[PDB]
Design an enzyme around this catalytic site. Structure first.
Site, PDB file in Angstrom:
ATOM      1  CD  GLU A 142      -0.352   8.143  10.135  1.00 42.69           C
ATOM      2  OE1 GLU A 142      -0.790   7.008  10.432  1.00 42.69           O
ATOM      3  OE2 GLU A 142       0.189   8.394   9.038  1.00 42.69           O
ATOM      4  NE  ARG A 143      -3.117   1.713  13.847  1.00 44.34           N
ATOM      5  CZ  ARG A 143      -3.460   1.227  12.671  1.00 44.34           C
ATOM      6  NH1 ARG A 143      -2.637   1.101  11.674  1.00 44.34           N
ATOM      7  NH2 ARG A 143      -4.687   0.851  12.484  1.00 44.34           N
TER       8      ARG A 143
ATOM      9  CE  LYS B 169      -2.235   1.158   3.771  1.00 42.65           C
ATOM     10  NZ  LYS B 169      -3.271   1.228   4.826  1.00 42.65           N
TER      11      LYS B 169
HETATM   12  N1  LIG Z   1       6.853  -2.830  -5.920  1.00 44.72           N
HETATM   13  C1  LIG Z   1       7.463  -3.635  -5.037  1.00 44.72           C
HETATM   14  N2  LIG Z   1       8.539  -4.231  -5.505  1.00 44.72           N
HETATM   15  C2  LIG Z   1       9.181  -5.020  -4.636  1.00 44.72           C
HETATM   16  N3  LIG Z   1       8.849  -5.245  -3.356  1.00 44.72           N
HETATM   17  C3  LIG Z   1       7.741  -4.627  -2.942  1.00 44.72           C
HETATM   18  C4  LIG Z   1       7.009  -3.817  -3.738  1.00 44.72           C
HETATM   19  N4  LIG Z   1       5.906  -3.295  -3.128  1.00 44.72           N
HETATM   20  C5  LIG Z   1       6.002  -3.825  -1.891  1.00 44.72           C
HETATM   21  N5  LIG Z   1       7.125  -4.642  -1.739  1.00 44.72           N
HETATM   22  C6  LIG Z   1       7.584  -5.352  -0.555  1.00 44.72           C
HETATM   23  O1  LIG Z   1       6.503  -5.370   0.410  1.00 44.72           O
HETATM   24  C7  LIG Z   1       6.919  -4.732   1.640  1.00 44.72           C
HETATM   25  C8  LIG Z   1       5.714  -4.026   2.318  1.00 44.72           C
HETATM   26  O2  LIG Z   1       5.163  -3.031   1.431  1.00 44.72           O
HETATM   27  P1  LIG Z   1       4.537  -1.678   2.023  1.00 44.72           P
HETATM   28  O3  LIG Z   1       4.297  -0.672   0.958  1.00 44.72           O
HETATM   29  O4  LIG Z   1       5.391  -1.104   3.108  1.00 44.72           O
HETATM   30  O5  LIG Z   1       3.174  -2.245   2.575  1.00 44.72           O
HETATM   31  P2  LIG Z   1       2.562  -1.695   3.898  1.00 44.72           P
HETATM   32  O6  LIG Z   1       2.727  -0.231   3.986  1.00 44.72           O
HETATM   33  O7  LIG Z   1       1.168  -2.110   4.122  1.00 44.72           O
HETATM   34  O8  LIG Z   1       3.399  -2.124   5.035  1.00 44.72           O
HETATM   35  C9  LIG Z   1       8.057  -3.792   1.195  1.00 44.72           C
HETATM   36  O9  LIG Z   1       8.926  -3.396   2.266  1.00 44.72           O
HETATM   37  C10 LIG Z   1       8.774  -4.650   0.150  1.00 44.72           C
HETATM   38  O10 LIG Z   1       9.608  -5.604   0.819  1.00 44.72           O
END
Ligand SMILES: Nc1ncnc2c1ncn2[C@@H]1O[C@H](COP(=O)(O)OP(=O)(O)O)[C@@H](O)[C@H]1O
Ligand SMILES: Nc1ncnc2c1ncn2[C@@H]1O[C@H](COP(=O)(O)OP(=O)(O)O)[C@@H](O)[C@H]1O
Ligand SMILES: Nc1ncnc2c1ncn2[C@@H]1O[C@H](COP(=O)(O)OP(=O)(O)O)[C@@H](O)[C@H]1O
Ligand SMILES: [Mg+2]
Ligand SMILES: [Mg+2]
Lengths: 456, 86, 57, 86, 456, 86, 456
Positions: A179-180, A153
């Site tokens: 927000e947290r 996300k």
């Molecule tokens: N486009 C992407 N390419 C590679 N890895 C990704 C990608 N999108 C998400 N990830 C992996 O998923 C993990 C969690 O994604 P994140 O955006 O932080 O989700 P959330 O915010 O819900 O925690 C990232 O730290 C990475 O390891």
């Protein structure tokens, strides 16, 4: 003139003013000698107004002096808000000094009129293949984002923030509704490390703040987006959670003593949603497009909060834990995600047929996979085996390397046009790339990059 | 609902698991920690990934426990590792 | 003939239990919609009784 | 011919005014006169007689019937027709 | 000084006194001429006090003079209360003349301090198979018999009184709160005919009595038990229905000017329950062993009253309507019932393993019951078919005919010991009785009689 | 022997009077003391001892017990026993 | 004397009169400048009375003069009302001039005494199979038609009006309480063209009308029926929807200052229903046979209004949306519908056993619905398979094409005698038709027509 506090009951404060100086509904008031701001909610009569405190009421007493400001909560707007973190009142919560503001705008205003609407249903080119193909976004539209944590996300929001600024000369605003504090600090550092912080303005209403702050933060972020729109730009407004905006309204309505409605929501539920959502539109000057995370209470899509929200949404992007497990990113579900713009009268017959063709192949492949898992691969017909091969190529071609994801993918980021997206999927559906291996389509961008990867 | 939305994660205990002899009644399927491996030592983080896969497999293969005779060796294998890890 | 009929029986039983699994899914989906209606109505009725009792006291 | 785009949105607007005026709610929190809100509106769509038109126009229009046809619209949740407003 | 009745609404009465002479909270008042007492619940201000009548209001008139007594409701305590039947105000409700009182105590008191709490774990045998197996009691602890209407709360309390009170050499208190007057008569003649009456203080407040009586009878019985505890004695305290104390507070709460909470209960539900339940305890001075029957409205254990009660008890015995509807008695649920004493470090590993073994078999059977009803028994595995047969036999071996239930069952009563109970359940779990028919375990005391019933 | 053909209709009549006297409502708009309405009625149906009859009749009747047996009736809605009055 | 309007809130108006001239409860009042009629509901004190307007309140203001008429709303009664249309106040609304009335009666009266009641049990044949089989009607008795929106209440009532007028030679009274104005126009012209109009009195207060009209129209029609009954005649009294009388009472209840009861209903719900329902009865002077349609809010038969109505009727006909969805008309439910005449001493053993046999088969088929839905019909026992086949035929044979429903489909209507009804169902229960196909019983009137339909 000045007023006096006459009654304090939690976050609700009653202030008495002289009969010729009673402040207007929504006016911002300042307590003398204390950093406390009050927003007027109702005029009770006898010179008395009922208000909600924009902070803690601890240590306040009856008889303190209060000053009227002459206007609603007025926040800084423009270029100076980029790369900064602010509260509901527009104060700089980051320890980076005062905001270099040139102008301030009130947070309350009417939505653009019937005569101010832009025109035809023009699309917003995100540069992301799966979204531009299956989930087309209209300029001035509202997008609902669904899914759990750890599914990409934040990365999806950072990619949209980079692309609107570099490829369309736009800007972004992020409204942290409830927000947290831990996640708010983590997101600020992730955007600084990903070099996207100077392209976005951050407005946070933290969970530990009173109900009035969590209810008004969405209007503060929206007021900053309206200034950028008036500069002639196309803007992105991100709302951390639209369910928390509804709940903050329920909490404030209960504090004011109003009679509750169905399922315990505020009687003003549809009007409070309409006042926020009707400002997000495409106008003759520019547009504001919004991406809103949606929470569904008790998994019931018929609940008043989800039901009132779905009347304003133009597209639905669903993030899948299963797709993320296969290594594909972004984890959008091409079958569950939808758009009102996915119509031949809106996007044209070629884009529509290509997108529906991809969905038909992926839907039939989902059915064939269950047959393979029960009867075995040998029970399928020769035509089904060819469809499985095309479905796997389409499924991998939906993947894309993001400029904010270079740290994870170890590959340079890519921006893919709508023209290149339609041409690539149309070719795979017609069979023009049947001779290439499934690994040639994974993480490449446009279709010419798959053709070159297959030779390595 | 309020507290589930305020916290960083949830450990869910279940009455059906507790009555089935699974004493620390932690439902691993719904329990979450949004901080995750950032809060784990190197050794635990390395050995935890395999443990999660087994418990998920057992969840998707529990019914076939009263009819293990008719299972592929590999599906039979996944199930026996799941029952021991649990 | 007896052994081939037993092969046909297991194949017929596979389809019957697949259909039973799918038919049960439709019943679960309909009951969930009825459950959500009862969940929303109970909250609305409790709130109406609390507001009604506090208007009198 | 008259079209009412969302008669269910008119009922939500009237419920808000009634709850803010503290009128005691009924089924699904709607006011007690919610039936009469729609019934008094839709009873106006009709066909009137030549005698009604002749009487209304003081004799100016003779020999013609007048009519108002209505196409109200109602949104339902999960296709449930048994709800109170529908 | 004296006050005058100013208002009467149901069981609630307002009395006005001189401002220099307002009576204290919980103070007892007496009406002139009429034989009625009032308890101050609140001081309303301007010399007026709100009170609940401790008798019927049909004869009362406005303007009757009322005398302040200067203290709370005070009842007789000590040896003179044994072998006597009394009302809420401590008056004798038997034809045996005045009580030989030497001291009177007020019914309102503070709970023992944190430093005064006891720590004993001495196991108490009850002679009932299910209770001794999954719900082991301890001397000086608190027991709750949870259940709806018509499942056995009074009958199990009468069997527990027979197996503990009679054999015990200390004093007992029996409090009938909101009970049927017929049960009180049967129990009085039973204690009198059994020659046990000289050891018991009987306090009765049945369903035909005003809300003020049912709101205070539990405090009267507890005040007599506290006098015996504070003398260094070991005491038994029985309460036929503690739910009736909460209900009397709900019936009067709205007339006392209190806004209602969830499910229509008084806002003070948890504090009114805590103020009573914290006094029912064993201390460093002496001990109180207590058994309370807890009514469950509409059989729903999630109702605010039953739900708030579990945290106050050491042993929780749950009676099920679904088991009673199958002719099985005592109708106790082995999966929902529990005790603080069910620990290998308190009892032993052999007992604990037998209890958890029985629970494991019954928990697995609960999911198979619904399977057998749609697809039949033949579709289960060889291990499942055998386990289901043992579960149905275990479910029947939990049954036992009680001496107090001979009028309902027709058969004679059976007392079973802890070792006999353990051995019988281990035999069914290990398979020593797989050859016996299912009907042989229904209503048969120890394991030997089941082997004999199979031959008839 | 006494038959009360509908105690649920007596409870509805008592709820009307109580709401018109403006007494605050309970669990289904029913008065707080709706339990005491029926418990005060039903505890009179009883069997009295020879001593009670001898005392009531001033010795005119002796060596005889007296009794009142009751058969109250209650109506449920679609088998729902969880309602306040039932 | 005269009074002055002091307050106006919707349909409710407060008027102040001199202390020596305060009007009585139910007395009619007239506003001087508009001639609008008001009915007094209660006396508030200080010479103030509260009333409901018998017309629109738009354009009324405080301070207008009001005249007391000295009596309740009085309407014309007797032979002069036959073949005429009247409003709530007894004015003609058919443009045919003034009513040639000999006398007028006040609309408020007490019910006939316990000594005036009639013990009639004479069977009334309706010519409709399901009604004559499981819901036999009686002359001088009360019938109720229960159902949700668009299920058949008006169509099934119009068919009953057509069939009962074949044997009945007296007068009829029809009261239109809160329904469609178009349906009143259709019924008036149908009877005028058919020459039936000179034996029917028509009263209307439809959905277009204010609350006061809809609340009192039922009383106006009943007052005309009571005149004909008291003349020693046998009359029919038909009510378009009795629920609207109760609903008009709910719209006004909060304005009358009353606290609401369960689900927002007036606290007087059962009394308002009993005061009207008890007047609709046969006496030793004459008889009233009455038929009423009952709307069921949101398809809920447990709703307070429908739930309170069942006790006032001799025959209850319950319509179902599930039955109407299968194609079966009339959509009656044999298992929920019942009559006081379904007794061996009233209808004879042959009819009684046929009706009981049909209900036993339909009840057993309803128990198998979930098993048949998951596993299909093939898994049932040889006995259950035969019963389900007969249940499906019985369920289809209960259908019948009506002479008022001909416009909807095209099929001609059918009248079936009680003799033919019993013979058909007895044969299907005995197994005399086990060989005919299931679709041969759908829409065929008498049993012999099912034999002819099977030839195709
Ligand atoms: N486009 C992407 N390419 C590679 N890895 C990704 C990608 N999108 C998400 N990830 C992996 O998923 C993990 C969690 O994604 P994140 O955006 O932080 O989700 P959330 O915010 O819900 O925690 C990232 O730290 C990475 O390891
Ligand atoms: N142990 C038992 N053996 C036989 N019958 C029993 C037993 N316990 C209860 N019953 C039956 O159930 C009825 C209700 O029991 P009771 O203790 O009065 O219920 P409660 O107090 O929970 O309302 C008894 O009168 C009797 O008919
Ligand atoms: N006997 C019938 N045969 C065929 N269709 C019917 C029959 N009864 C009702 N319907 C259908 O149902 C519709 C609604 O019936 P109606 O009597 O107006 O319902 P209600 O009065 O209960 O709202 C009819 O217009 C028709 O389409
Ligand atoms: Mg009991
Ligand atoms: Mg109709």
């Amino acid at each position: 003139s000045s007023g006096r506090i006459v009654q304090i009951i939690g976050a609700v404060i009653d202030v008495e003013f002289p009969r010729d100086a009673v402040p207007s509904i929504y006016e911002a008031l300042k307590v003398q000698g204390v950093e406390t701001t009050l927003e007027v909610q109702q005029q009770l009569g006898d010179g008395v107004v009922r208000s909600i405190a924009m902070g803690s009421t601890e240590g306040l007493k009856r008889g303190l002096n209060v000053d009227s400001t002459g206007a609603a909560i007025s926040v800084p707007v423009g270029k100076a808000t980029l790369g900064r973190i602010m509260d509901v009142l527009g104060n700089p919560i980051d320890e980076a000094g005062p905001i270099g503001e040139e102008e301030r705008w009130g947070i309350h205003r009417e939505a653009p009129s019937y005569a101010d609407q832009a025109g035809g249903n023009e699309l917003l080119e995100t540069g992301i293949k799966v979204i531009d193909l299956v989930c087309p976004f209209a300029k001035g539209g509202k997008v609902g984002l669904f899914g759990g944590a750890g599914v990409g996300k934040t990365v999806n929001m950072m990619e949209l923030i980079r692309n609107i600024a570099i490829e369309h000369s736009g800007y972004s605003v992020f409204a942290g509704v409830g927000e947290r504090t831990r996640e708010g600090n983590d997101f600020y550092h992730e955007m600084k490390d990903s070099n996207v912080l100077d392209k976005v303005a951050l407005v946070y209403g933290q969970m530990n703040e009173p109900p009035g702050n969590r209810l008004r933060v969405a209007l503060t972020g929206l007021t900053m987006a309206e200034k950028f729109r008036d500069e002639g730009r196309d803007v992105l407004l991100f709302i951390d959670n639209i369910y928390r905006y509804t709940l903050a309204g329920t909490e404030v309505s209960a504090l004011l003593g109003r009679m509750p409605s169905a399922v315990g929501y505020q009687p003003t539920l549809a009007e409070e949603m309409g006042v926020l959502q009707e400002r997000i539109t495409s106008t003759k000057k520019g547009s504001i497009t919004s991406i809103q995370a949606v929470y569904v209470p008790a998994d019931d899509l018929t609940d008043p909060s989800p039901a009132t929200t779905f009347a304003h949404l133009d597209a639905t992007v669903v993030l899948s834990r299963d797709i993320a497990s296969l290594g594909i990113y972004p984890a959008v579900d091409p079958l569950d995600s939808t758009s009102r713009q996915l119509d031949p009268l809106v996007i044209g017959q070629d884009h529509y047929d290509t997108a529906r063709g991809v969905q038909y192949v992926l839907q039939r492949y989902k059915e064939l996979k269950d047959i393979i898992a029960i009867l075995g691969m040998d029970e399928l017909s020769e035509a089904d085996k060819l469809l499985v091969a095309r479905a796997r190529k389409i499924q991998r071609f939906l993947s894309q390397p993001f400029f904010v994801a270079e740290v994870f993918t170890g590959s340079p980021g890519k921006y893919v046009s709508l023209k290149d997206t339609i041409a690539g999927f149309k070719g795979i559906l017609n069979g023009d790339y049947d001779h290439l291996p499934e690994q040639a389509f994974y993480m490449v961008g446009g279709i010419e990059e798959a053709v070159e990867k297959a030779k390595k | 609902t309020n507290v589930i939305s305020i916290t960083d994660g949830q450990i869910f205990l279940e009455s059906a698991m507790f009555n089935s002899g699974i004493r620390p009644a932690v439902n691993a399927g719904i329990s979450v920690s949004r901080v995750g491996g950032a809060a784990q030592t190197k050794i635990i983080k390395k050995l935890s990934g395999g443990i999660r896969t087994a418990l998920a497999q057992y969840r998707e293969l529990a019914a076939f426990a009263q009819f293990a005779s008719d299972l592929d060796e590999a599906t039979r294998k996944q199930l026996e590792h799941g029952q021991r890890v649990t | 003939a007896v052994v081939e009929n037993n092969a046909c029986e297991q194949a017929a039983r596979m389809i019957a239990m697949k259909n039973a699994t799918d038919n049960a899914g439709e019943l679960i989906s309909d009951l969930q919609l009825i459950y959500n209606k009862a969940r929303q109505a109970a909250i609305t009725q409790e709130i109406s009784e609390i507001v009604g009792g506090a208007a009198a006291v | 011919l008259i079209v009412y785009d969302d008669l269910s949105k008119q009922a939500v607007a009237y419920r808000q005014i009634s709850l803010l005026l503290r009128r005691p709610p009924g089924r699904e929190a709607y006011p007690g006169d919610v039936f009469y809100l729609h019934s008094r509106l839709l009873e106006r769509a009709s066909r009137v007689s030549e005698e009604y038109v002749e009487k209304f126009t003081n004799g100016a229009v003779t020999g013609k019937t007048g009519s108002l046809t209505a196409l109200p619209i109602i949104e339902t949740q999960a296709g449930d027709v048994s709800a109170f407003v529908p």
